[PDB]
């Protein structure tokens, strides 16, 4: 199961990633850093969890 985006940001930089109005992405990663790895139906960089709804599934 994915996550659910809730709020929507734009910018695009290393280590930076843009948030979606509403929709899902696949927000889950293990890292030794705070700094957390996410995947998005589409596109891959870097965790949204800034506001979205992760399941582990």
């Known amino acids: 199961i994915p996550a659910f985006v809730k709020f929507a940001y734009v910018a695009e ?14 927000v889950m990663e293990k890292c030794s850093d705070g700094w957390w790895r996410g995947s998005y139906n589409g596109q891959i960089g ?3 969890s800034n506001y979205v709804l992760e399941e582990v599934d």
């Open 46 to 48: 870097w965790f949204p």
């Open 13 to 26: 930089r290393e280590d930076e990633l843009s948030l979606v109005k509403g929709s899902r992405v696949t």
